[PDB]
């Protein structure tokens, strides 16, 4: 051993259909501007 | 009336070409549904993307752009109408010449575009939209820098694949002052974009901490709405994914007393993610591993491995296993985490788990074995107690089943753990 447990990301903060879809919570790709 | 809005836009005339532009407008910024594809259908996408020309006069590159913008707001078919047109060149071009009332729409379009597609977002930024965008941010108008940081955002948005990062790691200077904002929407844009950015290899990171990020991040996991917690935390999470001096910026700007805050979270991504933080600190070096027990942040995480939900409950599984690897160096650290109780969460976590886990626990598990049979001969004695920990705790049995494991790496553990101290 010795090996590494470092995780990045996507390897890890582990994993959910909705969890993904939720805290896809992000601020949202388009906006329309209005009056 | 759009056959008569069509014919007005054609005209030689500039104040009916104006008129007629308002009119589009008006209509792509109603309240309920923009007839988007009817205005693609009379073909003046071509039109309005000529009125966004140099020699245009300002109201009528406003006026068109703001429409070229909501068409651009929809679906990917119809902001592909606006790329296709060659719109966005257009857009890069005002982000200099324009008034801030321009330079503000301009830079909602193409954050629109951006926004769409990692094709489109790289589009944007080999036609160098980087310069002019920055240039963006000298101004002090709130709602120009607000807007600009968004579309910024969107641009460092993707991983499949990653944008260029020759590009986007030019904005890293920017996004530095910008988390110092005092504009909660400017704020929360700003640590999305450092989230993303701080997500990659050694360099990216490094990126990340030379322009002193870390410390504000830091600061800003305190911050009242989980808006701004859940960004800035999932940047701080991203960069204890690096090498242990890397990690040590993080410590060193005090992320450990924070994150002892955050495992309360209502939140639960907050929580995981702190867990998940955690152990990649936990990962780190022993005296890492040793501060982590310092901030006293072992007994909330032995509490979230025993009643957590599934998913924190994995993360606080690798806090622990991963602090328990230090333990070959000291044996305090063992004797710690066995005085805390975390034998019998790791236990009961070896039925439920899926492999990955179940091979971790076991690491665990050995690790804490490991040092109670040193714990024997270093002063003479007859068992080794934190087999006993186990046993009592029921771990034996669930490690002895283990061995009916599929998996070959699985089964090896958990046998020769069986085997050596059972």
């Not at chain 2, 119809?78 to 719109?87: F, G, L, R, S």
């Not at chain 2, 990659?200 to 996991?221: N, Y």
């Given at each position: 051993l010795g090996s590494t447990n470092k995780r990045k990301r996507e390897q890890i903060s582990t994993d959910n259909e909705a969890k993904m879809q939720i805290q896809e919570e992000k601020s949202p790709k388009k906006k329309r501007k209005k009056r | 009336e759009l056959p008569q809005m069509t014919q007005?836009?054609?005209?030689?005339?500039?104040?009916?070409?104006?008129?007629?532009?308002?009119?589009?407008?008006?209509?792509?910024?109603?309240?309920?549904?923009?007839?988007?594809?009817?205005?693609?259908?009379?073909?003046?996408?071509?039109?309005?993307?000529?009125?966004?020309?140099?020699?245009?006069?300002?109201?009528?590159?406003?006026?068109?752009?703001?429409?070229?913008?909501?068409?651009?707001?929809?679906?990917?078919?119809?902001?592909?109408?606006?790329?296709?047109?060659?719109?966005?060149?257009?857009?890069?071009?005002?982000?200099?010449?324009?008034?801030?009332?321009?330079?503000?729409?301009?830079?909602?379009?193409?954050?629109?575009?951006?926004?769409?597609?990692?094709?489109?977002?790289?589009?944007?930024?080999?036609?160098?939209?980087?310069?002019?965008?920055?240039?963006?941010?000298?101004?002090?108008?709130?709602?120009?820098?607000?807007?600009?940081?968004?579309?910024?955002?969107?641009?460092?948005?993707?991983?499949?694949?990653?944008?260029?990062?020759?590009?986007?790691?030019?904005?890293?200077?920017?996004?530095?002052?910008?988390?110092?904002?005092?504009?909660?929407?400017?704020?929360?844009?700003?640590?999305?974009?450092?989230?993303?950015?701080?997500?990659?290899?050694?360099?990216?990171?490094?990126?990340?901490?030379?322009?002193?990020?870390?410390?504000?991040?830091?600061?800003?996991?305190?911050?009242?709405?989980?808006?701004?917690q859940t960004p800035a935390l999932r940047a701080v999470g991203n960069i204890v994914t690096g090498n242990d001096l890397q990690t040590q910026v993080v410590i060193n700007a005090g992320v450990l007393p924070a994150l002892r805050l955050l495992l309360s979270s209502p939140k639960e991504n907050i929580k995981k993610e702190a867990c998940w933080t955690i152990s990649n600190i936990t990962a780190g070096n022993t005296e890492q591993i040793q501060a982590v027990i310092d901030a006293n942040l072992i007994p909330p995480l032995v509490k979230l491995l025993e009643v957590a939900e599934y998913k924190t409950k994995k993360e606080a599984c690798w806090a622990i296993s991963n602090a328990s690897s230090g333990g070959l160096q000291r044996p305090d650290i063992i004797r710690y985490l066995v005085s805390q109780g975390c034998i019998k969460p790791l236990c009961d976590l070896l039925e439920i788990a899926d492999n990955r886990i179940i091979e971790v626990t076991l690491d665990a598990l050995e690790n804490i074995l490991k040092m109670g049979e040193a714990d024997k001969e270093a002063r003479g004695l007859n068992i080794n107690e934190n087999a006993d920990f186990i046993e009592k705790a029921g771990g034996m049995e669930k490690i002895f089943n283990c061995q009916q494991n599929e998996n070959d790496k699985i089964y090896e553990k958990a046998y020769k753990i069986i085997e050596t101290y059972f």
């Open positions: - | 007005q836009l054609n005209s030689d005339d500039m104040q009916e070409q104006l008129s007629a532009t308002v009119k589009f407008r008006q209509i792509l910024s109603r309240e309920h549904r923009p007839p988007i594809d009817v205005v693609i259908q009379a073909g003046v996408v071509p039109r309005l993307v000529e009125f966004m020309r140099e020699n245009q006069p300002e109201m009528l590159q406003l006026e068109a752009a703001w429409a070229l913008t909501n068409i651009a707001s929809g679906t990917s078919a119809q902001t592909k109408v606006v790329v296709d047109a060659d719109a966005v060149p257009l857009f890069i071009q005002l982000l200099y010449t324009g008034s801030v009332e321009v330079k503000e729409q301009a830079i909602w379009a193409l954050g629109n575009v951006a926004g769409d597609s990692t094709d489109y977002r790289d589009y944007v930024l080999q036609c160098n939209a980087m310069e002019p965008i920055l240039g963006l941010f000298n101004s002090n108008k709130p709602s120009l820098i607000r807007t600009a940081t968004w579309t910024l955002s969107n641009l460092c948005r993707g991983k499949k694949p990653q944008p260029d990062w020759s590009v986007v790691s030019q904005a890293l200077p920017t996004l530095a002052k910008l988390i110092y904002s005092m504009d909660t929407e400017t704020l929360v844009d700003a640590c999305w974009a450092i989230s993303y950015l701080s997500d990659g290899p050694q360099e990216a990171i490094q990126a990340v901490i030379d322009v002193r990020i870390p410390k504000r991040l830091v600061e800003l996991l305190s911050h009242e709405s989980t808006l701004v």
